[PDB]
Amino acid sequence: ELEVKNMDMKPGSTLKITGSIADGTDGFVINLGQGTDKLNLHFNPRFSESTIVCNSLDGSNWGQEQREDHLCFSPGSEVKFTVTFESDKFKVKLPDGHELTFPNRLGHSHLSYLSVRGGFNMSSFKLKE
Amino acid sequence: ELEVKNMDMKPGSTLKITGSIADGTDGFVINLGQGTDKLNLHFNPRFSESTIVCNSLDGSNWGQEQREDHLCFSPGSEVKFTVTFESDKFKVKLPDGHELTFPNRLGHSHLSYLSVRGGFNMSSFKLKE
């Protein structure tokens, strides 16, 4: 579902995201970038594969995935994420507290697009630098 | 201009908005509805005209305006609005504390569209239900 167009996320901006993971779901997708053609951060936790997949979309080109094990969070309840945005790296605070790092391959310096996909009902959203 | 598409706001749910009013701006617009041609709530504080004009949009037809004279919030600071959605009316809480009631001309069940226009930089977005 949710789509957020035309937000102003500059380098150093800290994004706060909170919602409920649907019960009995494969996974969900949080996307940060310029649009659906240019995705700087492809955040895709997968309970089925017990991994968190991070990638980038540039037009019709997907970059190479990076997979993170921890997969601590489970479906059925409220979960908070925190995406810190630097023009070289993305930092992602997890529910437990551990952090994830993914390189900004698109070399951009401004994030405008947020879209939640899969089994995740976003309830709140906060943008602070 | 800011847009939030593909959300699911049902009657009884509360929408709270925190942002920053731009310094030296005429006013700003909050659009609640189901599209760009479907505005159930047109929330438009006008600092110049010193009135908050409320209206509905039905495709190519604006409804009839409802003007309020309780602008008690000023440009250049963090400000908060709360829009509770009911099947008959919208109840908008103002930062000072005043509640404004505006009828739901369009009816319907489903609120899917939010967009902020003018000199207003929404920093936070939260849904409760």
Curated annotation (Swiss-Prot), chains A, B:
Gene3D superfamilies: 2.60.120.200. GO terms for cellular component: galectin complex. Residues 1-128 form the Galectin domain. The keyword Cell membrane does not apply. Keywords: Lectin. Disulfide bonds: none annotated. InterPro entries: ConA-like_dom_sf, Galectin-like, Galectin_CRD. The keyword Protein transport does not apply. It holds the Pfam family Gal-bind_lectin. One of its GO terms (molecular function) is carbohydrate binding. It comes from the Eukaryota. GO terms for biological process: cell-cell adhesion; positive regulation of apoptotic process; positive regulation of inflammatory response; T cell homeostasis. A beta-D-galactoside binds at W62, G63, Q64, E65, Q66, R67, E68. This protein binds beta-galactoside. Its physiological function is not yet known. Homodimer. PANTHER family: GALECTIN, GALECTIN-2. This is Galectin-2. It comes from Homo sapiens (Human). The lineage of its organism: Eukaryota, Metazoa, Chordata, Craniata, Vertebrata. The gene is LGALS2.
